[PDB]
Design a protein around this ligand. Structure first.
Ligand SMILES: [K+]
Ligand SMILES: [K+]
Ligand SMILES: [Mg+2]
Ligand SMILES: [Mg+2]
Ligand SMILES: [Mg+2]
Ligand SMILES: [Mg+2]
Ligand SMILES: [Mg+2]
Ligand SMILES: [Mg+2]
Ligand SMILES: [Mg+2]
Ligand SMILES: [Mg+2]
Ligand SMILES: [Mg+2]
Ligand SMILES: [Mg+2]
Ligand SMILES: [Mg+2]
Ligand SMILES: [Mg+2]
Ligand SMILES: [Mg+2]
Ligand SMILES: [Mg+2]
Ligand SMILES: [Mg+2]
Ligand code: NA
Ligand code: NA
Ligand code: NA
Lengths: 54, 144, 53, 143, 107, 51, 122, 144
RNA sequence: UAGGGCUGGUGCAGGCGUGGCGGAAUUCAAUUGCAAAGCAAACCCGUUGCUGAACAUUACAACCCUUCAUGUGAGUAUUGAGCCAAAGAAGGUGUCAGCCCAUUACAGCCACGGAGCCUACGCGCCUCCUCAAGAGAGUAGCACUGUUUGGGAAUGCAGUGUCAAGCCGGCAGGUAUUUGUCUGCCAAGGUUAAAUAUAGAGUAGGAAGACCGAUAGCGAACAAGUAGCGUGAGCGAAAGUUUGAAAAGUACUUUGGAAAGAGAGUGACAUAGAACCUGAAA
RNA sequence: GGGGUGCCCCCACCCGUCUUGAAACACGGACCAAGGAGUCAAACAGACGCGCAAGGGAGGAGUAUUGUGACAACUCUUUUCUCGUACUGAAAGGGAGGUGUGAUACACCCGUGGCGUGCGCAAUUUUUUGCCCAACACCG
RNA sequence: GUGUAGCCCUCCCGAUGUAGACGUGGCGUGGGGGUGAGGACGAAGCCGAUGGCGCGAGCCUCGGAUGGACCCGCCUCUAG
RNA sequence: AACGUGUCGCGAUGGAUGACUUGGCUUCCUAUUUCGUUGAAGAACGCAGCAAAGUGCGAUAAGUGGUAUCAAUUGCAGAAAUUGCCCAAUCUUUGAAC
C-alpha cells in the first residue's frame, strides 16, 4: 500500500537502456583517467616544440 | 551487498512474503500516478491537497540571475568580522568595515540583538535594521 | 598542517584511556557501597518443604 | 542509560543555551558556593549570536573547534567523562542538560497535510506543481 | 553498475592518521603478524645514508644489521601457488606483506 | 616530549636523536580504518558484463 | 619476449612459434671446459653435436645428435633408443634443456655466432 | 599513550595468536600460561607478564617488567632456576610481578616438573628399544 | 639593400619507419620403501648437541596361521652448503625452479630506407616574385493550410496567393494593436585545424580483468555460419582426439572362417589398450 | 554405547496446490544427473553506523608522480556550484530579541515573554522548598 | 561481560501456530584483501552395516584391495 | 517348491563430478591506419609424389623474385633448403561488368 511519499517524476520512459532489441542511449566515463594522461602528454610535447614561446 | 537482503532469508519459503492469497502480480492499481481522481483519490487528497489545479500568473523567459538577493541578519554579523576585530569595538572609536557584496550577501535584515558596532556596506536594508545599527553606534553605507 | 589546508589532529574523547586505573583508584573506592555478608553454602541433606508433616 | 542511545536520540546543544541555563540557576546561589558543572551526553556547538559568556565548566562527548576556543577564551574549561568520574563521582554539584529535537525537519512532516487542523508539511518533490489558491485550502483549526 | 565510491576528504585523512599511530605500538605490530623480536626500537629510524646505496648486496647487509631480515625471510618462505580459479587469471602466485621503508622522495 | 634514537645503517650504534611527532599519539579508530579501506579498495576494479 | 603477465598470451606464442623461433627456444648449456674457452653460457643445439644427458632415464649417457625434431620439441641421439615388439630399434626423444653440450660442430657461421655472444671487455 | 584496555578491544576479535578451531578459542601466545584467550593471560599485551617453561632439565622463567616496553629486543629477560626447585619459590617470583597470577603460576610450575620427569623416562625407554633394533641407514649432519 | 626551401630547377644534412643482435649466478653434496627424516616450544644459544614404536635379521599386501615369491616412475620435494640481483617477471622443461632454457636493459649496436612528414618557416647555387560611393529580391515580410517545438494572440520549416525598404533604412529585444524613444547587430554567396563520437565497422599492434570455465562463455575452445532443413525469403546443430614422460600402440604360441578368446610381452600403474584422465546416480 | 537385518504388541489415509472446507470420484505428480526464478540503475522517505557543524559537500578540470600507478596524494584573498542558516504574497513588494519608561518614540544589554505539569542537582526535617533540561498544554 | 565451547553460582516467570514481521560471535557455495598451515611417506573429486559431535542447517575422524596434483582453517570484502 | 523381496562383495550400462584451457566476454591505449573501371567485395573452377575436407596459391598455381637469419622437412618417399618480413612479378571463368 502506498503511504505518505513524494509524487515521483523519474523521467525514464524512453528506450535508453541497451537490451536485446534496442541499441540504447548512454554515456560512460571509463576513459577519464586515460584521457587525463593524454592531455598532459600533449601539453608537454607542445611546450618542447615551441620553446621558448609561452 | 546481496548477502544482507531479505531474499537470502527467504530461500525455502515459496512466497517471499507476498502471501498465498493475493499473490505477487504485475501492476495492480495501475502504472505510475494513475487514478489520481478515481480509486486513488483518498491518498491524493489526504497527503497532497494542492496537487490538482492552477494558481497565479505566468512569467515567460525567467532569468534567475536578475533576482539574486541573499540576506543576512544583524545577529550574524560577527561571523564575517576578523577573528580579532570583534570584542574591542566601542561607541566612538574606529570600527571595522564590512562589505556584504564581497562575502556574497545583498540585503541586511534586522533580527536579533547586535553584538558589536560596525560599518556595513550593502545594497538593500530593512527599516528595522537601519534603526538598530544606528542606535548601537554603527552606520550603513549604500553600495551598488 | 602546512600541506593539507586547515587540517589538525582530532581531539581525543578521553583524556586518559586507562579505565581500569580509575575503577581501582582511591577516589572512586571511597564512595563505593559496602559489601554485605552472604549465606552459608547449602550442604547435603536437602531442606524440607512440607510445613505440616 | 543515555550512553547507550542512538545518535538521533543524543541531540546537540548550543553554547548559548548552556550559558542561559547556568545564569538562571547560579543567580540564586548562597554566599560561599561554587557554580555546578554542566553535563551533556552529546555534542556542544558554538553560537555566533551570544559572543559573551562567563567562565563555564562543561563535560561533553565532543566539542566543536570554535566552541572550544570560545569556552577557553572566556576562562572556562572543557572536561571529558573520564575526568568527571574522578573529580565528582556519584555526580555531586552537576547540572544535567539535553539538546533540542522538536525543531527537526523530519518532525515537521509528521501527519497528513490535508486533514483539518494539521499544519503538517507535505513531502514536496516539485514545488511549482503543488500550489493552491488561498481559497480551497483546508480548515486551519479543530477542537 | 556503480563500480567506484566517494569518500569524505576528512574521513580519509582520519584513517591515515589512525593507521600511523597503530604502527608505533609493538603489541599491535606483532598481532598483525610481523616478526620484530630483534628490532632495537619502535618506531625504527635509521640514518639517511641508505639512499646512496647502489648494489643489492649492500641493502641486504643493512637489513640484516638492523634486524629486519626476519620479516623478509618470512615472506620468502610463504610464496606458494594460489588455490582455485585465480591461478588461471594472471594471479598464479601469492605471498605475504613484509616491512615498508619510507623515503623523503621518490629517489 | 619523548625522544626517538636514530640507528646507523652499518653497525649497532645510536647516531642521533629526534622528537616524537604528534601524529603517533592520535586516537586509534580501527572502525574508521575498516570503513575507509572497504570503500577505497573498490576504486581499482575493472568493469565486466555479458553481450 | 614470450613471457608476459598474460598467461594465455604467453602460452599461445610459445606453442605457435615458427621454425626459426623454435631453434632459439631449444638451447642447451655448454660444458665447463667449453665455457672457459668461449665465455658463452649456452648455445642452440644443431645436428652432429655431441651431448651428455643430465636428467631423466638416460642419465649420464653420451652420444651424437642425429636429429633436431623441431615439430616435437625434442632431439634424437644415437645409442639412445628403445626396442619395439618385433625387434626394431627406434630413437627416443629428449628435451634439449635436459642435456649439456660437450663438443661443438664449427663452421664460419657458428664461429661468428660464438664471437658475437662472447662476454669480454674492450 | 594507549592503555592495554584499548589494545585488547582492538585485537580481541582478530589476531594471529587467536586459534578458533571447532568452536574452541585457544591461543598460541608464547607468553601465555594455559593458552586461554581471555586477557590477564596474554602476556604479549599486558605491560607486565611472566611465563614458565623448561630448558633441558631446568625450569626457565621469562619476565617482562613495565620498563622499556618500546624496545622489542630488551623487553624480556630470561632466568634459569636451580635443579629441583620447589614450586613455591617459582610462585613467589611470579607474584612479585603479577600478583593476580600467583595460583596459576604454582599449577604451571608443578606441571613443568612432571613433564621434565616424564620426558626423561620416555626417551630412555625409546633408546633401549633402538639398541636391540637394526636399521638400514643412518644419517649424519656434516660438521660446519 | 633583403626575404620566400609553399615560385621553379639542381645538390647536400639529421629524425620519424622496418628488421635483426647484445646482460649475472648450483643441474652443488647426500637415495630408489622404511633418516633425500626429525627434536632442542617468541629471539639467542645453534657454524651446536641428541636420534628411530616402518627393521626384535624388515614392515605392508584382505577369514586365521606358517612358508615361498613379487612391489615403489621422473628430484622444480626435504636437509646442508653457496652464488646473482640497476635482473625476484608471471612462459617452457617427466612433481612446487632467481642460479636447466628462453626472458628481464639501454639509466646501447648494426643493416635497408623510393616518396611523405619534422628540424634558425634545416643548409648552398641558378632563375622568378615580392618588400566620393556601395555592401547579395519572387529575397525578407504578410494571409490560408499542414507539420514541428517548452515556445504559450502562433519556436522553426513546407505548399499556394500576395510581395518590400534603403532624402527620417532593415532585423532582434519571449502577451496581441497603433504611435514615440533606447540598446545590440547588418540576412538573403563561399572556405576553415584543436578540444567531441565510434551504441553489432575495418588494417596492424599493445595493456589488461575481484568476468565465464565445455548444458557456462559468441551460434561456433573441434574440416562452424559447417553438417542438416525449406520452392524461396530464411533457419541452423551436436562434438574438449584430456592414453601415456615417452607409441615403448601388445612381436610370438595356441583355439577360431572371421570377429575375438586363452597365454606371453611393453610400461611404476593395462581395472592407462586407442576417441583410452577421474568414472557418480537411475 | 553405536550400526545392520528380521520378528512380536501398539500407533499410523498421498504429497504439492487453490479453497469456508482435500485421503478425495478436484488439478500437477515413471526414475536419475546437470541447469532453474526479487536483480542493476535513478528520485525520495524512515530506522541504524561514521565525519564535521551554522555550516556541510563537491563535480569537471588542473599540479606533482613502470612505480601495489585506471590506485593513492595535493588544489586556501573566505570555491567556481549546490543544500542549509528566513519566511511570506497571485504579484508589485516586504521581512521577525528582551526589559523598563512614555503614547524608524526614548534609555539599557550576564541573557530563559508569562503560566501549568515536568529527569536530575542544590537546601532544610525525620517533610517542604529552589533551579528547572528535554517534551506537552494555555495565553500574549 | 547483548550475542559462544555462553566469566561463574543461585532463584522466578513464559514456551503450540497459517498469512506476515524481526533476530542469530547461526549453517553451506564461487571469487578479492590479510594472516596461518597442509601435499608424491599422496591434493581435489568419488565410494561406505566408519563412528563421534550439534535441537538443526551441518562439521570432523576412519577405511578404500579409489585417485594422481593441488588445497584448506580464521578475520573481513564481494556475488550469475 | 518356483516366482518375488532385502542386505553385502564384485561386475555391466552411462557419462556426472574434480582438476586442466592455444576459446569467449568486457574495458583502455598507440599509428606515415580506410576499397573499386590501373576492374573491387562476393561467387565458380582448378593447382602437392602419394592430397577427401580445411589452409595457401592461379596454367610462373601448398608457389617465382628480394632481404634478414643460418641447416633442415618429417607419416613415408624424395633431396644433400626452411622460417620471418617485403619492394619486383604472375594472377583461370565471372561479378558495378561495359
Ligand atoms: K630441464
Ligand atoms: K517569398
Ligand atoms: Mg576516446
Ligand atoms: Mg495485493
Ligand atoms: Mg480476493
Ligand atoms: Mg547585407
Ligand atoms: Mg562548412
Ligand atoms: Mg557452447
Ligand atoms: Mg577411464
Ligand atoms: Mg468450492
Ligand atoms: Mg491435500
Ligand atoms: Mg468423492
Ligand atoms: Mg513458536
Ligand atoms: Mg511461515
Ligand atoms: Mg561466479
Ligand atoms: Mg541463480
Ligand atoms: Mg557482357
Ligand atoms: Na551452442
Ligand atoms: Na479448486
Ligand atoms: Na486449474
Amino acid at each position: 500500500p502506498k503511504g505518505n511519499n513524494a509524487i515521483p517524476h523519474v523521467h525514464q520512459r524512453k528506450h535508453w537502456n541497451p537490451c536485446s532489441s534496442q541499441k540504447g542511449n548512454v554515456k560512460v566515463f571509463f576513459n577519464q583517467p586515460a584521457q587525463k594522461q593524454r592531455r598532459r602528454r600533449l601539453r608537454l610535447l607542445k611546450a618542447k616544440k615551441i620553446f621558448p614561446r609561452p | 551487498p546481496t548477502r544482507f537482503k531479505k531474499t537470502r532469508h527467504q530461500r525455502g519459503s515459496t512466497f517471499c512474503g507476498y502471501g498465498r492469497v493475493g499473490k505477487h502480480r504485475k501492476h495492480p492499481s495501475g502504472r505510475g500516478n494513475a487514478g489520481g481522481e478515481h480509486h486513488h483519490r483518498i491518498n491524493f487528497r489526504k497527503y497532497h491537497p494542492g496537487y490538482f489545479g492552477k494558481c497565479g500568473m505566468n512569467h515567460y523567459h525567467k532569468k534567475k540571475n536578475t533576482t539574486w538577493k541573499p540576506t543576512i541578519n544583524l545577529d550574524n554579523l560577527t561571523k564575517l568580522m576578523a577573528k580579532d576585530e570583534a570584542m574591542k569595538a566601542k561607541k566612538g572609536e574606529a570600527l571595522p568595515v564590512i562589505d556584504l557584496l564581497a562575502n556574497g550577501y545583498s540585503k541586511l535584515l534586522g533580527n536579533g540583538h547586535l553584538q558589536a558596532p560596525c560599518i556595513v556596506k550593502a545594497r538593500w536594508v530593512s527599516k528595522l535594521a537601519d534603526k538598530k545599527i544606528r542606535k548601537a553606534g554603527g552606520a550603513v553605507v549604500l553600495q551598488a | 598542517s602546512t600541506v593539507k589546508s586547515g587540517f589538525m589532529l582530532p581531539a581525543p574523547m578521553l583524556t586518559s584511556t586507562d579505565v581500569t586505573r580509575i575503577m581501582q583508584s582511591e577516589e572512586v573506592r571511597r564512595v563505593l557501597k559496602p559489601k554485605k555478608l552472604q549465606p552459608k553454602r547449602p550442604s547435603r541433606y536437602r531442606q524440607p518443604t512440607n510445613g505440616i508433616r | 542509560k543515555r550512553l547507550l542511545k542512538s545518535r538521533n536520540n543524543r541531540a546537540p546543544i548550543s553554547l548559548s543555551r548552556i550559558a542561559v541555563c547556568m545564569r538562571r540557576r547560579t543567580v540564586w546561589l548562597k554566599k560561599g558556593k561554587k557554580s555546578p558543572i554542566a553535563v551533556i551526553v552529546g555534542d556542544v556547538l558554538d553560537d555566533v549570536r551570544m559572543t559573551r559568556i562567563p567562565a563555564l565548566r562543561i563535560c561533553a562527548l565532543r566539542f566543536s573547534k570554535s566552541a572550544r576556543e570560545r569556552i577557553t577564551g572566556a576562562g572556562g574549561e572543557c572536561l571529558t567523562f573520564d575526568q568527571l568520574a574522578m573529580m565528582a563521582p556519584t555526580g555531586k554539584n552537576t547540572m544535567l542538560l539535553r539538546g533540542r529535537k522538536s525543531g527537526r525537519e523530519s518532525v515537521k512532516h509528521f501527519g497528513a497535510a490535508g486533514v483539518p487542523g494539521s499544519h503538517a508539511k507535505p513531502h514536496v518533490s516539485s514545488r511549482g506543481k503543488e500550489r493552491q489558491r488561498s481559497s480551497k485550502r483546508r480548515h486551519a483549526f479543530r477542537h | 553498475r556503480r563500480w567506484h565510491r566517494k569518500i569524505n576528504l576528512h574521513q580519509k585523512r582520519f584513517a591515515v592518521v589512525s593507521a600511523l599511530a597503530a604502527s608505533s605500538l609493538p603489541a599491535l605490530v606483532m598481532s598483525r603478524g610481523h616478526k620484530i623480536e630483534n628490532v632495537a626500537e619502535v618506531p625504527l629510524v635509521v640514518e639517511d645514508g641508505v639512499r646512496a646505496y647502489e648494489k643489492t648486496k649492500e641493502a641486504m647487509t643493512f637489513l640484516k644489521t638492523v634486524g629486519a631480515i626476519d620479516d623478509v625471510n618470512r615472506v620468502n618462505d610463504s610464496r606458494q601457488i594460489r588455490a582455485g580459479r585465480g591461478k588461471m587469471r594472471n594471479r598464479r602466485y601469492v605471498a605475504r606483506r613484509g616491512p615498508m621503508l619510507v623515503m623523503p622522495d621518490n629517489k | 616530549r619523548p625522544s626517538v634514537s636514530v640507528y646507523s645503517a652499518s653497525e649497532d650504534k645510536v647516531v642521533g636523536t629526534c622528537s616524537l611527532p604528534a601524529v603517533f599519539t592520535a586516537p586509534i579508530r580501527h572502525d574508521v580504518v575498516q570503513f575507509v579501506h572497504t570503500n577505497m579498495a573498490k576504486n581499482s576494479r575493472q568493469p565486466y558484463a555479458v553481450n | 619476449g614470450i613471457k608476459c603477465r598474460n598467461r594465455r598470451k604467453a602460452r599461445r606464442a610459445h606453442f605457435q612459434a615458427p621454425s626459426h623461433v623454435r631453434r632459439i627456444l631449444m638451447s642447451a648449456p655448454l660444458s665447463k671446459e667449453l665455457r672457459a674457452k668461449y665465455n658463452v653460457r649456452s648455445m642452440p643445439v644443431r645436428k652432429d653435436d655431441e651431448v651428455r644427458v643430465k636428467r631423466g632415464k638416460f642419465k649420464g649417457r653420451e652420444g651424437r645428435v642425429t636429429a633436431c625434431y623441431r615439430l616435437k620439441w625434442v632431439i634424437h641421439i644415437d645409442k639412445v633408443s628403445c626396442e619395439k615388439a618385433n625387434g626394431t630399434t627406434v630413437p627416443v626423444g629428449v628435451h634439449t634443456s635436459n642435456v649439456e653440450i660437450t663438443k661443438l660442430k664449427l663452421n664460419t657461421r657458428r664461429k661468428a655466432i660464438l664471437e658475437r655472444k662472447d662476454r669480454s671487455t674492450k | 599513550t594507549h592503555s592495554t584496555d584499548l589494545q585488547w578491544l582492538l585485537v580481541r576479535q582478530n589476531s594471529k595468536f587467536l586459534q578458533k578451531r571447532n568452536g574452541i578459542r585457544l591461543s598460541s601466545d608464547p607468553f601465555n600460561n594455559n593458552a586461554n584467550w581471555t586477557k590477564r593471560q596474554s602476556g604479549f599485551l599486558n605491560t607486565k607478564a611472566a611465563v614458565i617453561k623448561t630448558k633441558g632439565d631446568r625450569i626457565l622463567l621469562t619476565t617482562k617488567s613495565g620498563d622499556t616496553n618500546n624496545k622489542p629486543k630488551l623487553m624480556y629477560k630470561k632466568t634459569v632456576m636451580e635443579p629441583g626447585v620447589k614450586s613455591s619459590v617459582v610462585k613467589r617470583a611470579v607474584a612479585d610481578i603479577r600478583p593476580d597470577l600467583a595460583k596459576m603460576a604454582y599449577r604451571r610450575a608443578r606441571k613443568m616438573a612432571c613433564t621434565i620427569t616424564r620426558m626423561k623416562k620416555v626417551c630412555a625407554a625409546r633408546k633401549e628399544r633402538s639398541s636391540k633394533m637394526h636399521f638400514h641407514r643412518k644419517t649424519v649432519r656434516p660438521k660446519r
